[PDB]
């Protein structure tokens, strides 16, 4: 059950927004990664 | 100098990514002594 964001540093699926901060959960680190779609992406191998 | 939760070691990797300014601060040793 889900993903939205990631901790640049302490490596750990976060998931949060607005009035929420922009920090973390078991690293207090202020940099955050978006995190990959599940819509599947295709490549031509050319 | 933070937004909130305050004053922290900064590595160069993070200053780059947060648009920070890899800075340290300056401290003198001051003296009051009286003369007009
Ligand atoms: Zn973290």
Q: How was this entry determined?
A: X-ray
> Residues of A at the B interface (Cβ-Cβ below 8 Å)?
8, 23, 28, 30-31
Selection from A36, A30, A34, A43 nearest residue A15 by Cα: A34
A7 is in an annotated binding site: yes
- Cβ atoms of A6 and A14 within 8 Å: the answer is yes
**Is A31 within 8 Å of B5 when comparing Cβ atoms?**
no
The resolution in angstroms reads 3.3
A1-46: what CATH class? mainly beta
CA of A3 to the centre of ligand 1 (A): 14
Asked if residues B17 and A40 have their Cβ atoms less than 8 Å apart, the reply is no
Sequence-ordered list of residues with C-beta below 8 angstroms from that of B15, at least 6 positions apart, any chain? B21, B22
Residue A24 CB partners (closer than 8 Å, separation 6+): A7, A9, A10, A12, A14, A30
Contacts of residue B31, defined as CB under 8 A and 6 or more positions apart, other chains included, come to none
b/e string for B4-34 if b means 16 or more Cβ within 10 A? eeeeeeeeeebeeeeeeeeeeeeeeeeeeee
Q: Ligand 1 centre from A37 Cα, in Å?
A: 21
């Amino acid at each position: 059950a889900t993903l939205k964001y990631i901790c640049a540093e302490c490596s750990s699926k976060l998931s949060l927004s607005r009035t929420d901060a922009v920090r973390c959960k078991d690293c207090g680190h202020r940099i955050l990664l978006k995190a990959r779609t599940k819509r599947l992406v295709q490549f031509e191998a050319r | 100098n933070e937004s909130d939760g305050v004053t922290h070691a900064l590595y160069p990797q993070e200053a780059r990514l947060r648009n920070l300014t890899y800075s340290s601060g300056l401290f003198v040793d001051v003296k009051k002594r009286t003369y007009e």
